[PDB]
UniProtKB/Swiss-Prot annotation, chain E:
Belongs to the RNA polymerase beta' chain family. The tandem heptapeptide repeats in the C-terminal domain (CTD) can be highly phosphorylated. The phosphorylation activates Pol II. Phosphorylation occurs mainly at residues 'Ser-2' and 'Ser-5' of the heptapeptide repeat and is mediated, at least, by CDK7 and CDK9. POLR2A associated with DNA is specifically phosphorylated at 'Ser-5' of the CTD by CDK7, promoting transcription initiation by triggering dissociation from DNA. Phosphorylated at 'Ser-2', Ser-5' and 'Ser-7' of the CTD by CDK9 (P-TEFb complex), promoting transcription elongation. The lineage of its organism: Eukaryota, Metazoa, Chordata, Craniata, Vertebrata. This is DNA-directed RNA polymerase II subunit RPB1. Residues 173-206 are annotated as: Trigger loop. The chain holds residues 911 to 1162 of 1970 of the full protein. The gene is POLR2A.
Length: 115, 151, 59, 67, 244, 50, 260, 82, 148
């Protein structure tokens, strides 16, 4: 009667943006990233990678509601830095880490398959 | 199905305006099963939060000015305490005094009456949980709790 | 158990909503509810529920 | 009424273990040793094979609707 | 409290110059010691508080000070201490005459009954009586000097808060206090239990009261003795036999 | 203390005297109240009819 | 302010499970990888059934839902196929689906066990796991003399978040800090608890001492595959999938920054 | 009743406020003239509430007394508490 | 400088009333330069303390070696000269009570300043000549360093 489609969690709706940036007015150099059709899989890795950046004063994620499949990520950086730049570098760093982890896994698989 | 009825309910029967009841001049709705047991184990003296966990909690605060508080421990590792976060949850600059369920009767007479070893004798000052373990007596439906004083 | 109603069928004897999901009936605004809304002082709501939303009529 | 395909908890295939499980029990094997030989270590999968009731075998005792 | 403690706790001592010099500043202490009209105002306040003291004894014959009132003065005073950063160790700049004059002016601003006629003024004096008593006993000149130690700005804000907090606690016209009372009395009836001496309690006892019954289930008396019979058991038994 | 005799000592303090009281199974106020050594001020009952 | 330099050390690799260890990485990266193994790894599974005849004691929905949970070999085919959402074809096609067929009838007196071996596919690469050339064949339904079961199924590409049938894992034993050094847990009686298989401690001890400057590292894994994807392919497909989401997310980000 | 000496309370009751916001919202809903400015509000409720806080509601409350008299108290003469 | 009190204490007892918590312990200490008793609660998990130890306590209103008030906010991106680098254990709290033996006429000779470091309570009682900078509702630090 009301069971929502399962693919509605990952597929973006027509006319809906994958990510929206809203400048926070409470404190300076802060932004809120409202990403649609995501879950804790991405919020945590981006959160953790953001904390490791010393120019990031605040980095957190939340799910407004589990039934929804969106996520909100708050990023506060130093005046000399920018939050959007941190969200970008955090992704670029994660991509390189996975690329390195991927290559090092093939080698381990190859070394194990041979002997 | 009318603006009059809509406005009437919006000013007389809403939940916020119905927190305190004239039946017993005390709140009827209070903290509940999980939020009451965890808040007890959250405001304890041996509860320390790291830089990562705090940012996760503060992110769920609507009444947050966006300024992280100076932790109660800056070295050797920056650690926030549960009471240091609850102080941000408590609004305004209210003042209250309660007693934990395990508050012994032979404590307010002898020494340590203002510095409790078991972290009893809840004391809120200027909207900050100076000390104490919160329970139903401080957040439940009892009279004079932090909620009744908040309303 | 999910049930909803908005301008549905009505009985024959009294022009009030039916009773039951099978008949698309409405929910009962019993006496205890009349007493509760009386305490709130909500007269318009008590009027809209018992007169305008149940069985309005002109004579 | 019939052995499921996957385990509700983990997702391990169990549909191919019922017949083998019965073939072992009749061989004087214990329910535990039999589940170990099939590769069921987690108590979640072992639950599916040890708590299942083969009711389809009783539904097949009734003649069908068409011959 | 006893008469001695009540005097030592509420009577402003304008004789000990050393104490006042610690509680009050230099300008205020010399005015209290030199001026005599002020010393009479403080003495009249203590007498007015002593009259109220007996009014409470006849109202509360039992030692039960727990009372229900609109505004909590102890908390508003505490809130004022933190809002203005009051130092309980430094002398206060609050003239005790401003405390008395402020309380008297405040009691007039709390109007449960509107009207200057003697009939309305008596009801207003009797309506805000219990509050005006708790007000004069908490906002006393002495307590505000050695216990709370509020300043001039903090006191003015305190009065404005009591007036606003009180005017908001007044019953609003149209409030259906009838059903509000039946629900407040019927709600606990669903939680209470259905079932020396056996006494009927709970719904059965609540029932028999609302529907006055000429044959209750457990009717009983509460006999109190007057003199020696109230202390000894031999004479009391004689009275028991004279009733049983 | 709700049934004791709460008096006011000469010093101004509340004193709860432990005095004997009788609890009956019936209700006869007009006769019980009119008895010697019985307090005609505090003696009451639960039968609101009487 | 940069990425880590993680390492890997495989302690066991088979056709069913793979046990590896990741070091010098954050707990979030290790957890998300665990979530991808279950919920963000594409795989082929039945998602469409058309019952032409079913005289068995099990209704259609019981069989359809049962067919979906049958694992299909999708090692190299899932990467070539496309999602029905992105495909420009009709309801079905060979590029976005794999057609199946089933035709069984119990003519003899003995009970006929309709198994996955009867599922005839048009693509020889995508076939039931048990049918891949020990393990027995999956049991779909039993038939009585005179009963018949004939249908025409179609498989599609999907992942776990849509349905559990698209989950290639049969258990992901994620563990870190076997010895409670970081004290993330608080054993009221550490002596009453057992030792982890990855623990390095004497039997006389219960848990390692506290490490204030310690960080979650050396995450252990055991990816037991259902059979469709090899235990190693799940990891590679997982990291590539998790790397694709971040890549697409980075593109949408740049699309929003330049627009602002 | 002498309007110069009105014995009723000077504050607006929660019920008087409710009906005022309601009745005023209906008028605005019927495309009635607005008394105060509006930034982007389109709901008659938010419009009526701002009019009360601004104290620019053209309505008179006829407080009936038990004896039969009545007192006409304007929304501008009453003191809003909540 | 911004220092409200400084002395060397010696732990005389730890949790006399019994161990109430796990990651926290109550220390009963006494000084020698001023003879000021001290009851403090620290996190023995990250800063273990054994009976008989000796540490230097410095109650300060700010961490910057130069006189400058703090903003009460957590800003780890601050390279200013802080006196915390010279110490091991540092806490942040506020004064919520200042007791004494003052009478109706005589001033206070002995005081007892109470501080709360986000739940961790401290009681420093001694001579009033050493506790003049303490005022209620004032932010202070600890600057505790263990020495041999
Ligand atoms: Zn399982
Ligand atoms: Zn296609």
């Amino acid at each position: 009667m009301n069971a929502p489609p399962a693919f509605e969690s990952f597929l973006l709706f027509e006319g809906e943006k994958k990510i929206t940036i809203n400048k926070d007015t409470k404190v300076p150099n802060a932004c809120l990233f409202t990403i649609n059709k995501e879950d804790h899989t991405l919020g945590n890795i981006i959160k953790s990678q953001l904390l490791k950046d010393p120019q990031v004063l605040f980095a957190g994620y939340k799910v407004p509601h589990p039934l929804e499949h969106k996520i909100i990520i708050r990023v506060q950086t130093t005046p000399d830095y920018s939050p959007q730049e941190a969200f970008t570098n955090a992704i670029t760093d994660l991509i390189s880490e996975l690329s390195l982890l991927e290559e090092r896994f093939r080698v381990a698989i190859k070394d194990k398959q041979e002997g | 199905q009318s603006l009059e009825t809509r406005a009437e309910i919006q000013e007389l029967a809403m939940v916020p305006r119905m927190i305190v009841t004239p039946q017993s001049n005390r709140p009827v709705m209070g903290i509940v099963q999980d939020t009451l047991t965890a808040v007890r184990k959250f405001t304890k003296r041996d509860v320390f939060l790291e830089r990562g966990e705090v940012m996760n909690l503060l992110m769920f605060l609507s009444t947050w000015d966006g300024k992280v508080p100076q932790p109660a421990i800056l070295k050797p590792r920056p650690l926030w305490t549960g009471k240091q976060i609850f102080s941000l949850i408590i609004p305004g600059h209210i003042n209250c005094i309660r007693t934990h369920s395990t508050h012994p009767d032979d404590e307010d007479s002898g020494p340590y009456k203002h510095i409790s070893p078991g972290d009893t004798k809840v004391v809120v000052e200027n909207g900050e949980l100076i000390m104490g373990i919160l329970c139903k007596k401080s957040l439940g439906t009892s009279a004079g709790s932090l909620v009744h004083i908040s309303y | 158990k999910i049930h909803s109603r908005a301008r549905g069928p009505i009985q024959i004897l009294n022009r009030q909503p039916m009773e039951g999901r099978s008949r698309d009936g409405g929910l009962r605004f019993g006496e205890m509810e009349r007493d509760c809304q009386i305490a709130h002082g909500a007269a318009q709501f008590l009027r809209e529920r018992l007169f305008e939303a149940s069985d309005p009529y002109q004579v | 009424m019939i052995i499921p395909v996957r385990c509700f908890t983990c997702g391990k295939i169990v549909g191919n273990k019922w017949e083998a499980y019965l073939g072992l029990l009749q061989a004087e094997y214990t329910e535990g040793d039999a589940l170990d030989a099939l590769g069921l270590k987690r108590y979640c999968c072992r639950r599916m094979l040890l708590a299942h009731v083969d009711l389809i075998e009783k539904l097949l005792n009734y003649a069908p609707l068409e011959k | 409290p006893s008469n001695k403690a009540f005097e030592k706790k509420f009577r402003f001592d304008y004789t000990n110059e050393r104490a006042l010099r610690r509680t009050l500043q230099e300008d205020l202490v010399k005015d209290v010691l030199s001026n005599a009209h002020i010393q009479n105002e403080l003495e009249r306040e203590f007498e007015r508080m002593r009259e109220d003291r007996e009014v409470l004894r006849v109202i509360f014959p039992t030692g039960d000070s727990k009372v229900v009132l609109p505004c909590n003065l102890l908390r508003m005073i505490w809130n004022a201490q933190k809002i203005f950063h009051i130092n309980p160790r430094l002398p206060s700049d609050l003239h005790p005459i401003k405390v008395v004059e402020g309380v008297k002016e405040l009691s007039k601003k709390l109007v449960i009954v509107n009207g200057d006629d003697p009939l309305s003024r008596q009801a207003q004096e009797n309506a805000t009586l219990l509050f005006n008593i708790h007000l004069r006993s908490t906002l006393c000149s002495r307590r505000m000097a050695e216990e709370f130690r509020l300043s001039g700005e903090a006191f003015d804000w305190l009065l404005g808060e009591i007036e606003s907090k009180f005017n908001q606690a007044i019953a609003h016209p149209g409030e259906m206090v009838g059903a509000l009372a039946a629900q407040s009395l019927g709600e606990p009836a669903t939680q209470m239990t259905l079932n020396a001496k056996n006494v009927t309690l709970g719904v059965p006892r609540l029932k028999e009261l609302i529907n006055i019954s000429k044959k209750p289930k457990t009717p009983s008396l509460t006999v109190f003795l007057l003199g020696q019979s109230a202390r000894d058991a031999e004479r009391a038994k004689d009275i028991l036999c004279r009733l049983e | 203390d709700n049934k004791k005799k709460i008096i006011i000592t000469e010093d101004g303090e509340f004193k709860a005297l432990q005095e004997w009281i009788l609890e009956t199974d019936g209700v006869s106020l007009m006769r019980v109240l009119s008895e010697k050594d019985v307090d005609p001020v505090r003696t009451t009952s639960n039968d609101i009819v009487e | 302010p940069y990425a880590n330099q993680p390492t890997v050390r495989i302690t066991e690799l088979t056709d069913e499970n793979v046990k590896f260890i990741i070091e010098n990485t954050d707990l979030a990266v290790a957890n998300s990888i665990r979530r991808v193994f279950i919920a963000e790894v594409p795989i082929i599974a039945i998602d469409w059934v058309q019952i032409d005849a079913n005289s068995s004691v099990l209704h259609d929905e019981f069989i359809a839902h049962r067919l979906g949970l049958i694992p299909l070999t999708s090692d190299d085919i899932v990467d070539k196929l496309q999602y029905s959402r992105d495909c420009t074809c009709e309801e079905f096609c060979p590029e976005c689906s794999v057609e199946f067929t089933l035709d069984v009838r119990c003519n003899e007196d003995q009970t006929r066990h309709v198994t996955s071996r009867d599922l005839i596919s048009n693509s020889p690469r995508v076939i039931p796991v048990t049918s891949r050339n020990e393990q027995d064949d999956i049991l779909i339904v039993k038939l009585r003399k005179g009963q018949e079961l004939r249908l025409r199924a179609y498989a599609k590409k999907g992942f776990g978040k849509e349905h559990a049938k698209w989950n290639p894992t049969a258990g992901v034993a994620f563990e870190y800090d076997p010895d409670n050094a970081l004290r993330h847990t608080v054993y009221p009686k550490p002596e009453e608890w057992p030792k982890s298989e990855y623990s390095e401690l004497d039997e006389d001890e219960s848990q390692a001492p506290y490490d204030p400057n310690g960080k979650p590292e050396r995450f252990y894994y055991n990816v037991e595959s259902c059979g469709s994807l090899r235990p190693e392919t799940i990891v590679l497909s997982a990291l590539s999938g998790l790397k694709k989401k971040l890549s697409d997310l980075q593109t949408q980000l740049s699309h929003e920054i330049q627009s602002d | 009743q002498a309007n110069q000496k009105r014995i009723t309370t000077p504050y607006m009751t929660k019920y008087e406020r409710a009906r005022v916001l309601g009745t005023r919202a209906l008028q605005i809903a019927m495309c009635a003239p607005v008394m105060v400015e509006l930034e982007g509000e389109t709901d008659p409720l938010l419009i009526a509430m701002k009019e009360l806080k601004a104290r620019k509601i053209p309505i008179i409350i006829r407080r009936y007394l038990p004896d039969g008299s009545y007192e006409d108290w304007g929304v501008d003469e009453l003191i809003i508490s909540d | 400088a911004g220092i409200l009190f400084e002395d060397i204490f010696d732990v005389k007892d730890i949790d006399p009333e019994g161990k109430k918590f796990d990651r926290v312990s109550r220390l009963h200490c006494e000084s020698e330069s001023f003879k000021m008793d001290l009851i403090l609660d620290v996190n023995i998990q990250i800063y273990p303390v054994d009976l008989g130890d000796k540490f230097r306590l410095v109650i300060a209103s700010t961490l910057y070696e130069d006189g400058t008030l703090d903003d009460g906010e957590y800003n780890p991106t601050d390279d200013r000269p802080s006196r915390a680098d010279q110490f091991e254990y540092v806490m942040y709290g506020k004064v919520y009570r200042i007791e004494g033996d003052e009478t109706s006429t005589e001033a206070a000779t002995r005081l007892s300043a109470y501080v709360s470091y986000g739940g961790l309570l401290m009681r420093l009682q001694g001579d009033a000549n050493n506790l003049h900078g303490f005022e209620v509702d004032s932010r202070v630090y600890l600057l505790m360093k263990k020495l041999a």
